[PDB]
Write an enzyme that holds these catalytic residues in place. Structure first.
Site, PDB file in Angstrom:
ATOM      1  N   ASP A   1       0.856  -1.297  -0.136  1.00  0.00           N
ATOM      2  CA  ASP A   1       0.063   0.067  -0.079  1.00  0.00           C
ATOM      3  C   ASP A   1       0.844   1.252   0.055  1.00  0.00           C
ATOM      4  OD1 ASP A   1       0.417  -0.458   3.180  1.00  0.00           O
ATOM      5  OD2 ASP A   1      -0.584   1.390   3.089  1.00  0.00           O
TER       6      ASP A   1
ATOM      7  N   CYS B   1      -8.113  -4.165  -2.787  1.00  0.00           N
ATOM      8  CA  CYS B   1      -6.835  -4.380  -2.064  1.00  0.00           C
ATOM      9  C   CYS B   1      -7.498  -4.381  -0.631  1.00  0.00           C
ATOM     10  CB  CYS B   1      -5.875  -2.991  -2.409  1.00  0.00           C
ATOM     11  SG  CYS B   1      -6.570  -1.317  -2.650  1.00  0.00           S
ATOM     12  N   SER B   2      -6.858  -3.471   0.340  1.00  0.00           N
ATOM     13  CA  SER B   2      -7.297  -3.564   1.630  1.00  0.00           C
ATOM     14  C   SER B   2      -8.444  -2.532   1.571  1.00  0.00           C
ATOM     15  CB  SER B   2      -6.337  -3.314   2.612  1.00  0.00           C
ATOM     16  OG  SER B   2      -6.831  -3.187   4.064  1.00  0.00           O
ATOM     17  N   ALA B   3      -8.264  -1.275   1.313  1.00  0.00           N
ATOM     18  CA  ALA B   3      -9.357  -0.649   1.550  1.00  0.00           C
ATOM     19  C   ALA B   3     -10.028  -0.100  -0.024  1.00  0.00           C
ATOM     20  CB  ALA B   3      -8.708   0.982   1.645  1.00  0.00           C
ATOM     21  N   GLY B   4      -9.475  -0.884  -1.174  1.00  0.00           N
ATOM     22  CA  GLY B   4     -10.107  -0.747  -2.472  1.00  0.00           C
ATOM     23  C   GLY B   4     -10.217   0.564  -2.997  1.00  0.00           C
ATOM     24  N   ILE B   5      -9.036   1.570  -2.803  1.00  0.00           N
ATOM     25  CA  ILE B   5      -8.941   2.953  -3.626  1.00  0.00           C
ATOM     26  C   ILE B   5      -7.744   3.105  -3.935  1.00  0.00           C
ATOM     27  CG2 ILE B   5     -11.110   3.964  -2.104  1.00  0.00           C
ATOM     28  CD1 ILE B   5      -9.007   5.351  -0.209  1.00  0.00           C
ATOM     29  N   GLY B   6      -6.584   2.646  -3.328  1.00  0.00           N
ATOM     30  CA  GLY B   6      -5.303   3.085  -3.703  1.00  0.00           C
ATOM     31  C   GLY B   6      -4.542   2.076  -4.919  1.00  0.00           C
ATOM     32  N   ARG B   7      -4.000   1.092  -4.374  1.00  0.00           N
ATOM     33  CA  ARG B   7      -3.719  -0.016  -5.538  1.00  0.00           C
ATOM     34  C   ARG B   7      -4.859  -0.051  -6.473  1.00  0.00           C
ATOM     35  NH1 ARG B   7      -1.208  -3.725  -0.883  1.00  0.00           N
ATOM     36  NH2 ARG B   7      -2.900  -2.777   0.152  1.00  0.00           N
ATOM     37  N   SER B   8      -6.205  -0.319  -5.951  1.00  0.00           N
ATOM     38  CA  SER B   8      -7.305  -0.856  -6.753  1.00  0.00           C
ATOM     39  C   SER B   8      -7.395   0.262  -7.770  1.00  0.00           C
ATOM     40  CB  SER B   8      -8.702  -0.832  -5.984  1.00  0.00           C
ATOM     41  OG  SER B   8      -8.479  -1.958  -5.071  1.00  0.00           O
TER      42      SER B   8
ATOM     43  N   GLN C   1      -4.032   6.901  -4.071  1.00  0.00           N
ATOM     44  CA  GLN C   1      -3.745   7.525  -2.987  1.00  0.00           C
ATOM     45  C   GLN C   1      -2.604   8.159  -2.666  1.00  0.00           C
ATOM     46  OE1 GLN C   1      -5.555   7.183   0.694  1.00  0.00           O
ATOM     47  NE2 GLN C   1      -6.838   7.773  -1.186  1.00  0.00           N
TER      48      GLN C   1
HETATM   49 MG   LIG Z   1       1.012  -2.670   2.381  1.00  0.00          MG
END
Ligand SMILES: [Mg+2]
Ligand SMILES: [Mg+2]
Ligand SMILES: [Mg+2]
Ligand SMILES: [Mg+2]
EC number: 3.1.3.48
Length: 297
Positions: A180, A214-221, A261
């Site tokens: 992330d 991803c974890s939050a679904g906004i950055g990598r996603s 992000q």
């Molecule tokens: Mg990470």
């Protein structure tokens, strides 16, 4: 083309932070009233990451809330579902959404454990002989096979609606080494993975929207979907010069908050789209070079 000119201008002036902050300032602000209802607090992984009401995915049960957004890119004619990494209590909801939305691919850009903490539940089976049954949503999930590469894994899953006994093949594309708040290690590694998703047929308009998380679904996603949409726009027009990456990102942000992000993820998106343009415009052999540079074997 003009994106490459803009890229070198921003790089020369060192203004990626300022460019990125202006996107944040201009981004849409829509209500998330359902996400913030008290009964849904335990369905949200992060207090500050919620789906807008107007674009949220509704479960077809008679509590319909999941932290997931339909990114409907009208001009590109492709849609994506961006969602958080499911929680121990929303894994049934996750697969219910996959079923109801008729998705055939799930793109996972995170690991279940990152930086010493659990960023996503173990929502799929790791062994063939230990299938998962989601009693709440009447779904059964079986690991059929998996192909483990140096930095990503592709899994074949079988998802069964136990009410109707219909079964579907779901492809799981799992990126292993993309932390992330960072960009991927190389455009080549990222594009090799993206085009593996594309080649699978999981992005076909004949299927439901691919699920990306991803974890939050906004950055990598958001980085994944921005690169794909920009390449698709360029592809339909066969005109890379016509793509305005910041405009596309602002459009995506009408459907889910916070997509991309960091300034370096925005910079990386330019890099990936500029490189992917070579393939779109007919240098087909460049895909083989990405696969070699990605050292997937
Ligand atoms: Mg990470
Ligand atoms: Mg531009
Ligand atoms: Mg059925
Ligand atoms: Mg980075």
């Amino acid at each position: 083309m003009e994106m490459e000119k803009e890229f070198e201008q921003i790089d020369k002036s060192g203004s990626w932070a300022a460019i990125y902050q202006d996107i944040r300032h201009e981004a849409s602000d829509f209500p998330c009233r359902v996400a913030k209802l008290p009964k849904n607090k335990n369905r949200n992984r992060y207090r500050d990451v919620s789906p807008f009401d107007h674009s949220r995915i509704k479960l077809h049960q008679e509590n319909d809330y999941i932290n997931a957004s339909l990114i409907k890119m009208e001009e590109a004619q492709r849609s994506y579902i961006l969602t958080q990494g499911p929680l121990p209590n929303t894994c049934g909801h996750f697969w219910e959404m996959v079923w109801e939305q008729k998705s055939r691919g799930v793109v996972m850009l995170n690991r279940v454990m990152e930086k010493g903490s659990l960023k996503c539940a173990q929502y799929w089976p790791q062994k063939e002989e230990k299938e998962m049954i989601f009693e709440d949503t009447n779904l059964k999930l079986t690991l059929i096979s998996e192909d483990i590469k140096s930095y990503y894994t592709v899994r074949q899953l079988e998802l069964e609606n136990l009410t109707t006994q219909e079964t579907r093949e779901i492809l799981h594309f799992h990126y292993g080494n993309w932390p992330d708040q960072t960009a991927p290690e190389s455009p080549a590694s990222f594009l090799n993975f993206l085009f593996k998703v594309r080649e699978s047929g999981s992005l076909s308009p004949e299927h439901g929207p691919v699920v990306v998380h991803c974890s939050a679904g906004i950055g990598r996603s958001g980085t994944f979907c921005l690169a794909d949409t920009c390449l698709l726009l360029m592809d339909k027009r066969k005109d890379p010069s016509s793509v305005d990456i910041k405009k596309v990102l602002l459009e995506m942000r009408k459907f889910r908050m916070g997509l991309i992000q960091t300034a370096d993820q925005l910079r990386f998106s330019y890099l990936a789209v500029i490189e992917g343009a070579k393939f779109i415009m007919g240098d087909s052999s460049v895909q083989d070079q990405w696969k070699e540079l990605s050292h997937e074997d």
